[PDB]
Design a protein around this nucleic acid. Structure first.
Ligand SMILES: [Mg+2]
Ligand SMILES: [Mg+2]
Ligand SMILES: [Mg+2]
Ligand SMILES: [Mg+2]
Ligand SMILES: [Mg+2]
Ligand SMILES: [Mg+2]
Ligand SMILES: [Mg+2]
Ligand SMILES: [Mg+2]
Ligand SMILES: [Mg+2]
Ligand SMILES: [Mg+2]
Ligand SMILES: [Mg+2]
Ligand SMILES: [Mg+2]
Ligand SMILES: [Mg+2]
Ligand SMILES: [Mg+2]
Ligand SMILES: [Mg+2]
Ligand SMILES: [Mg+2]
Ligand SMILES: [Mg+2]
Ligand SMILES: [Mg+2]
Ligand SMILES: [Mg+2]
Ligand SMILES: [Mg+2]
Ligand SMILES: [Mg+2]
Ligand SMILES: [Mg+2]
Ligand SMILES: [Mg+2]
Ligand SMILES: [Mg+2]
Ligand SMILES: [Mg+2]
Ligand SMILES: [Mg+2]
Ligand SMILES: [Mg+2]
Ligand SMILES: [Mg+2]
Ligand SMILES: [Mg+2]
Ligand SMILES: [Mg+2]
Ligand SMILES: [Mg+2]
Ligand SMILES: [Mg+2]
Lengths: 129, 150, 141
RNA sequence: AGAAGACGGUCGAACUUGACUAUCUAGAGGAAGUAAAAGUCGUAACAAGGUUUCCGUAGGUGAACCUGCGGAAGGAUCAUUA
RNA sequence: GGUGACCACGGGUGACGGGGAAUCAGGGUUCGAUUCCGGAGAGGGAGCCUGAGAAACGGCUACCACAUCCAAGGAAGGCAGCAGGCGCGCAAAUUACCCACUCCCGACCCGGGGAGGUAGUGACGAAAAAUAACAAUACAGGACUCUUUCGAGGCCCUGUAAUUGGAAUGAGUCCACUUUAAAUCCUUUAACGAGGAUCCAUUGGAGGGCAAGUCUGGUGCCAGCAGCCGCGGUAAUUCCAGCUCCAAUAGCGUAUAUUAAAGUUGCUGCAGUUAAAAAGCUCGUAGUUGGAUCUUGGGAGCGGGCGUCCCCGCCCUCUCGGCGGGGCCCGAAGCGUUUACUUUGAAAAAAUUAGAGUGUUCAAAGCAGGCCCGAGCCGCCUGGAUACCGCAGCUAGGAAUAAUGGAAUAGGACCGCGGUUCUAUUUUGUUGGUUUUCGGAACUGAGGCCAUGAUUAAGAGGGACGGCCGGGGGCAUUCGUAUUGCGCCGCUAGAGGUGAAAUUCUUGGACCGGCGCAAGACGGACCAGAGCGAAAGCAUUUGCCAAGAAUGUUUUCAUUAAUCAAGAACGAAAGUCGGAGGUUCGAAGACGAUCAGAUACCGUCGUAGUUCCGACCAUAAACGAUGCCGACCGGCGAUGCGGCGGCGUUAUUCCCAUGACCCGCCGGGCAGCUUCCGGGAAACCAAAGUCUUUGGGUUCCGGGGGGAGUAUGGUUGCAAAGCUGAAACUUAAAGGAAUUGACGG
RNA sequence: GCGGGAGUAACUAUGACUCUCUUAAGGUAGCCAAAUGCCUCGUCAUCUAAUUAGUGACGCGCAUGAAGGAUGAACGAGAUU
RNA sequence: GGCGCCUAGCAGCCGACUUAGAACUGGUGCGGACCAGGGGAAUCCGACUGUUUAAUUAAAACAAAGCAUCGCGAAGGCCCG
């Protein structure tokens, strides 16, 4: 059964991006997915996304801008401290010039640069570059 | 997929987005409640009550029109069945299969289906004992289950 | 696939230490039966008494009489065969000599065309075979 | 004030005996596995290997093997006509 | 009672534990007998005196094992302290000097200390660093230059060899000083001390990997080399040597343990169709993992510049606010859950690790040191940081993520109002009488109010219901020809079988034809890359019995789920046991052929079996050689089932329904074709894709080939056998996919 | 009821193998100097100081052998060490 | 009957044997007589229990369950006469 809604959504986005589609539909929506997509949209890797609201869990239609390479997930949400965030960063990112790691922190869902900026750790969510 | 079958069917019910009661429904909440009471006294399980109400009296969702579910209404009035409907039907099926099997000893297919049904019974009973619907000491005995159903 | 849950460490480590017995190096180094079967008993070198001088036929593509000595080790009394590794160093070997024997190169495995020989003589009568071969010092008459 | 000594109790070494358990180890005879000799007999497997091969099971034969029953194609057929 | 699959208990350890060490992307893997801390022991045990402290052993007692002296009556032992012996070994130092330093003990400034310091042995290992430098001649070379190769010097850099050829130094001899308890060593410093500067650099190599010779002489598959490929059988790039080169250098080779290489143990991060590999199938407990949903946006001046950036201010309650009665303020009580998480702070031995400062002559080190001294400085300035220290425990901020709960038989929250029992203090100050609703706590009855209180109903699941659908299963029943045998009838000499025959049956009527009878098997054609079932498997008719997927659903419950060690059900064929039955076929067996032989292939016969009922067994190339659940990622035409919508044809009927076709759509299946989605070693695969751009959940399982699925132990079985399952030893390949050739009865 | 004779493997020794004669078929699975083996107190091992005894093993077995062969607990006033 | 709470059960009386534990004690003797299995490792045969030569053989012999074969449908099979 589906146990990682964020993982399913991220895999769907990655496959649609690889196939070159202009829009992608991810069926199970959640607050975590919306926050992840908001982070990606603020960093410009995706376009606008619109939430179709049924009385069940909603759906999301994302406009793909074509500038995404990978948007994978780290399924076991490991506890990430600021002392090992660098090791996570150079394990998951293509380079130190670009690429972001989204981790859920006590201050909210945000990328690793903002996490280090406001000096907090959290649980790993995923990455995109 | 199915719990005990290699089937991946999709046949379901698509509840509409409009939760509002249709304007052509003249039945009020108390009227629907009285209909449910009459059907429950006649002996219908909540699934059958809902089916009759939807087919004949034109009510779409008892929860939408009254604010409460059928089992909640029955339990509030005090005439809900002692066993849950699905558990009762599983025990009924198991009793029927055992009755067939005690005459057809070579029906190994029936023995396999009986094992599947009893596994479902035990899992559902575990769920109900967790939710405290059933007594904490409730146990399904194959010998004494025949007097509980039909 | 493999399990990835946050509290699967017990299963991960149990599976790892179960599967670690299936490679030859770990099994040899941690079972102990190889240590018992090793004539040296986990020692780099050993001492022995030359029981005999023998010649061993080389393998199929080669054709030579490799010069070896049958040696009984002073400790645990095990009998082994040790190659004498130079042109004329068998002449420096006689009966009842106290020879030092080392491994023959690849950790208890036969080397080259010499079948079933895992040791070689380093010193005889507390003088090095290299020294005797180069003539830097003489047999203790 | 009092030593030797004695009855009893308690820790209890040690000896004898028996049991259990670890390794090492002899053994008539039997039965295997490796290696080398162009040793003897055959030619079962590779081609349709000259009875297609192989699996499970059972019986039989100097030896590879053979045969029955069910299976596989990793076949020598991706196909055979209203 | 207590402990156990969250691994108890038992066994092993070549286990003292830790601080730490090796290796070094990250993660890890090994090692810690060893100087610091903690523990234990003093030949093995055991028991004690004394003392604050011992189950002390440089204390005692006894036994055991060793072992000393003896006048044989007795007596005395404990170096895993410092040295030093023997033994064991591959393996490890002097029976030296001193309490001078650091400290310890004592009645104590004074004694003692094999603690400890010093020296000796010491290529364990680490740091520095000699074996030569310069100049001038010849012969070369240079972007050299001077006339345009010709010849030279107004230059530079090597090598060859010399009466060069005179400069600098040590390594050593050795006086003194210094050091030191006394010496030694180092640093100073006299004097000797270098031209094969003979004051002499070695260890391994020169086919490849891997830097270096297709040199020469011997040997001739011998000797030998060779970690691996390999060299050597008379012209050796590989052996034995000479010469010459190569690498490191006062070090280098070898053996062994271990680390990296090894993404060949894979958490990061491996694989499992064909290379080794997914259990025959399903259920299923522990374990692991689990859908969505509860506060978001609005504010003001400081503001990563309302500068529509935003340090950022945010536009819990009640108790004496310590500046019985002030707004001049911030303390006492609780958290409208409990946790995980994250950040901070504390507490975390030193040494070591990283790292700050410091010219030890540089460095490894060490924790030192530096400023002036004009000679009066009748002395000044410092340092002896800091970081890390897992996990567990403590504290304070945050509340995203994840678990967990609150009100459903209201036994709910909050505001009060009745009626209950006690009591710290009352003071209705002379004591005593005390009223104390005094203050709060004791249970209990009737109210008001809360918007009174149940998130939604997953392209999650279970269940109900409707019409179907299907070689799904069991029981009974019906039919079909065929085969074999038998009985009658007809006519005949062959019939059968084969590559050819023969065994065999035949004037006794064999075979053949006809009519019947009996028995037991088997359900052809229809029958398909069609269906159903968890697989194994399932195909004559009809009836009965339960079961089921898919579909339809504006039905119901509301997370009840996925995968699953242990355990359980079923599980082709063969085989086993008991009872029936035994037509055909047919292991074993017999015979005839074939053949060199023929225990076979071919033919004739034929036992067990093949059939049914009941009980075992639990194995197959049990195959898709391919785990399950979930999501995504091309096209196309079909097919099976169900549903939905449409021109028409057809069946009867008078029209629609309902069947049979035709055209589509949807869902679940068996598949097929095609594709530069992508993957893969490729064959190939729309899964074997979405994998170095590596993480959806979870189960099993492989680690070169053999030995070997063997031995042994355990367990199951009537047996056959099934499950679990090594090691010694051996080997450099064994294998997979494709290409070319050769070959094919 | 269930056979003979010859030759044959790179040391010898055996004979997997090959020839023939013959039978109705040539003794298969097993088991053994057995309560069944003459030779015989067979040969080897074990048990003892010493064993024509016992046990284990071997098998061309005068003359073992399958409705009886071979095993196997329990039992036996059975025979033996 | 207004009249009260054994409700963690009390009070009195009566009664067999049996078991367990402790102290003391005797010249270590105590199932004190009587009653009352020596044990173990194997081989052969017979499965076992049973039976047998009264008056020399109790056995390995006979029987046995089990297994297999044969005859017979009554005008019959087997047997007496
Ligand atoms: Mg064959
Ligand atoms: Mg063949
Ligand atoms: Mg130890
Ligand atoms: Mg230690
Ligand atoms: Mg210590
Ligand atoms: Mg002690
Ligand atoms: Mg002591
Ligand atoms: Mg020198
Ligand atoms: Mg050379
Ligand atoms: Mg390594
Ligand atoms: Mg691998
Ligand atoms: Mg394979
Ligand atoms: Mg479970
Ligand atoms: Mg969730
Ligand atoms: Mg014929
Ligand atoms: Mg079967
Ligand atoms: Mg039978
Ligand atoms: Mg036949
Ligand atoms: Mg999984
Ligand atoms: Mg292997
Ligand atoms: Mg025989
Ligand atoms: Mg005999
Ligand atoms: Mg005899
Ligand atoms: Mg005797
Ligand atoms: Mg015997
Ligand atoms: Mg034998
Ligand atoms: Mg008897
Ligand atoms: Mg018997
Ligand atoms: Mg009698
Ligand atoms: Mg008599
Ligand atoms: Mg008698
Ligand atoms: Mg019998």
């Amino acid at each position: 059964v589906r146990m990682n809604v964020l993982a399913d959504a991220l895999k769907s986005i990655n496959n649609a991006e690889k196939r070159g589609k202009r829009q992608v539909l991810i069926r199970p929506c959640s607050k975590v997915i919306v926050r992840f997509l908001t982070v990606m949209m603020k960093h410009g890797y995706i376009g606008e996304f619109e939430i179709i609201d049924d009385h069940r869990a909603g759906k999301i239609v994302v406009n793909l801008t074509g500038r995404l390479n990978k948007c994978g997930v780290i399924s076991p949400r490991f506890d990430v401290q600021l002392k090992d965030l660098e090791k996570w960063q150079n394990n998951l990112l293509p380079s130190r010039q670009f690429g972001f790691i989204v981790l859920t922190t006590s201050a909210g869902i945000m990328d690793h640069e903002e996490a280090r900026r406001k000096h907090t750790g959290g649980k790993i969510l995923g990455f995109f570059f | 997929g199915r719990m005990h079958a290699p089937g991946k069917g999709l046949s379901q019910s698509a509840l509409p987005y409009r939760r509002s009661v249709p304007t052509w429904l003249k039945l009020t909440s108390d009227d629907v409640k009285e209909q449910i009471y009459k059907l429950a006294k006649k002996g219908l399980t909540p699934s059958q009550i809902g089916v009759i109400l939807r087919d004949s009296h034109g009510v779409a969702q008892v929860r939408f029109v009254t604010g409460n579910k059928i089992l909640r209404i029955l339990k509030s009035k005090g005439l809900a069945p002692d066993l849950p409907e699905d558990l009762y039907h599983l025990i009924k099926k198991a009793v029927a299969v055992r009755k067939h099997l005690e005459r057809n000893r070579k029906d190994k297919d029936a023995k396999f289906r009986l094992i599947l049904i009893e596994s479902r019974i035990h899992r559902l009973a575990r769920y109900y004992k967790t939710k405290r619907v059933l007594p904490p000491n409730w146990k399904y005995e194959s010998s004494t289950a025949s007097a509980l159903v039909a | 696939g493999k399990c990835r849950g946050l509290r699967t460490a017990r299963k991960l480590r149990s599976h790892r230490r179960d599967q670690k017995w299936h490679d030859k190096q770990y099994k040899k180094a941690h079972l102990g039966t190889a240590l018992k079967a090793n004539p040296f008993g986990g020692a780099s070198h050993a001492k022995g008494i030359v029981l005999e001088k023998v010649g061993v036929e080389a393998k199929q593509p080669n054709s030579a009489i490799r010069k070896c000595v049958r040696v009984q080790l002073i400790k645990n009394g095990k009998k082994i065969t040790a190659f004498v590794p130079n042109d004329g160093c068998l002449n420096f070997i006689e009966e009842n000599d106290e020879v030092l024997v080392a491994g023959f190169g690849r950790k208890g495995h036969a080397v080259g065309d010499i079948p079933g020989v895992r040791f070689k003589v380093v010193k005889v009568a507390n003088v090095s075979l290299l020294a005797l071969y180069k003539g830097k010092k003489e047999r203790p008459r």
